[PDB]
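Q: What does the assembled structure look like for these inputs?
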Amino acid sequence: GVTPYSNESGLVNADLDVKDELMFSPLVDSG
Amino acid sequence: THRVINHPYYFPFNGRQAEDYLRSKERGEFVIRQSSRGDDHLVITWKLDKDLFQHIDIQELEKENPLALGKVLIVDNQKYNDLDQIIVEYLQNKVRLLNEMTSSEKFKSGTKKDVVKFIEDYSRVNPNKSVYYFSLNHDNPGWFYLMFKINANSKLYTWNVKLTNTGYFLVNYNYPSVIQLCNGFKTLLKSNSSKNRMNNY
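A:
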């Protein structure tokens, strides 16, 4: 049939290709 | 073939009719319907957002006759006893987790292009900060984009988070909450980053 089943897709993640220093916000308590 | 399924949410819809029926409904509403994959399958179609729908396969086992609903139902590789259990334990948890994500301060509404624009603008203003947001994947319902820049001059990376009924799946793990997903994303990237800097010689 025509209907898509998006729970069956697989989406590839781009590889991190840099040595740059990460500067994200802090981790936080999970609560 | 037209199966008589005795359930308050059963409609004999194709996927397009199901989406049309749900168009004016709210997030989390759904229909159960006949499958194009055969008389041992059903579909649950549910609404994530405006014009955004997901169709999930239900595999039937232990069928007493070819047209009757199987006494065992498989959804996303897990076994359920009946359609009400699927609604309660599969669908309603998935909707709960969708609302948790779209309620997060790390979630941005809009198309991918809209969110890239915000990320680029945010990076222009904060060029030495790493920036990341989640947004809805409109082309693959049930997924989120996880978009990030390391700094103003870095490329914009897109990773993919799958919504499940028990959490948010990213790379190798199903994070049970958005806070843990954010913490885990940072940990994962710190790990890959420190690996990139290793001296293999």
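DSSP finds four helices and ten strands in chain B.
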